[PDB]
Amino acid sequence: GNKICQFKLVLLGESAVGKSSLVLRFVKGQFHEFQESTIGAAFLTQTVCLDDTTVKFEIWDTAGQERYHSLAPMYYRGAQAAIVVYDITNEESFARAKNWVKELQRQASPNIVIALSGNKADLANKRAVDFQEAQSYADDNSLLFMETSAKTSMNVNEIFMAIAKKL
Ligand SMILES: Nc1nc2c(ncn2[C@@H]2O[C@H](COP(=O)(O)OP(=O)(O)NP(=O)(O)O)[C@@H](O)[C@H]2O)c(=O)[nH]1
Ligand SMILES: [Mg+2]
């Protein structure tokens, strides 16, 4: 097809859950075991083919440390979609993700599409967040949920493409 669409996506979540790794995997097909914590935010773009349409993603990978919380609106204000990321081995990160979802539902665009990534799924031998519990939470809050692994690539392209399909 000759149709081209572009949209703004923001990633939010507690520090160390794998936001930068998820974007690097999607955009560059890379994964770095030693990824440094992000300062403020990083910007990346990727263009994909979505059933007859060329979709360009403008992605804001926010720094998740609490000291950067006040900067979040600068990145989500004009976003058409968000991926709130947690680490399946860390329940506190899952609780933090729920608070990011609440903030988006109250302060971002009322039409924003929100996805929830249960990342580091390759570490299921240390799971702390039950898949079904997270799925139920996502269903009750109208969030597009998938467990992902930036390390193995599991569901990485899938979650970004599913979001694009719903915009
Ligand atoms: N096993 C595993 N490790 C992962 C996965 N995603 C990220 N990691 C690791 O987790 C650590 C933190 O990842 P990173 O992408 O920097 O996290 P972040 O959410 O961007 N942190 P910040 O918000 O501070 O910038 C890194 O050592 C990275 O390699 C994953 O899916 N599986
Ligand atoms: Mg980061």
Swiss-Prot record:
Activity modulation comment: Regulated by guanine nucleotide exchange factors (GEFs) including RINL, which promote the exchange of bound GDP for free GTP. Regulated by GTPase activating proteins (GAPs) which increase the GTP hydrolysis activity. Inhibited by GDP dissociation inhibitors (GDIs).
GO cellular component, one term: actin cytoskeleton
Subcellular localization, as worded in the UniProt entry: Cell membrane; Early endosome membrane; Melanosome; Cytoplasmic vesicle
Principal location class: membrane
Motif Switch 1: chain residues: 30-42
Membrane topology designation: Lipid-anchor
Outcome following mutation: residue 65 to L: Loss of GTPase activity. Does not inhibit filopodia formation
Post-translational modification: Phosphorylation of Ser-70 in the switch II region by LRRK2 prevents the association of RAB regulatory proteins, including RAB GDP dissociation inhibitors GDI1 and GDI2. (Microbial infection) Glycosylated on arginine residues by S.typhimurium protein Ssek3.
Source species of the chain: Homo sapiens (Human)
Glycan-modified residues: 106
Keyword list, A-Z: Cell membrane, Cell projection, Cytoplasm, Cytoplasmic vesicle, Endocytosis, Endosome, Glycoprotein, GTP-binding, Hydrolase, Lipoprotein, Membrane, Nucleotide-binding, Phagocytosis, Phosphoprotein, Prenylation, Protein transport, Transport
Function: The small GTPases Rab are key regulators of intracellular membrane trafficking, from the formation of transport vesicles to their fusion with membranes. Rabs cycle between an inactive GDP-bound form and an active GTP-bound form that is able to recruit to membranes different sets of downstream effectors directly responsible for vesicle formation, movement, tethering and fusion. RAB5A is required for the fusion of plasma membranes and early endosomes. Contributes to the regulation of filopodia extension. Required for the exosomal release of SDCBP, CD63, PDCD6IP and syndecan.
Domain notes for this protein: Switch 1, switch 2 and the interswitch regions are characteristic of Rab GTPases and mediate the interactions with Rab downstream effectors. The switch regions undergo conformational changes upon nucleotide binding which drive interaction with specific sets of effector proteins, with most effectors only binding to GTP-bound Rab.
GO annotation, biological process: amyloid-beta clearance by transcytosis; canonical Wnt signaling pathway; early endosome to late endosome transport; endocytosis; intracellular protein transport; modulation by host of viral process; phagocytosis; positive regulation of exocytosis
Designated name of the protein: Ras-related protein Rab-5A
UniProt keyword Transport present: yes
Binding site for GTP: 15-16, 18-21, 32-33, 38, 64, 119-120, 122, 150-151
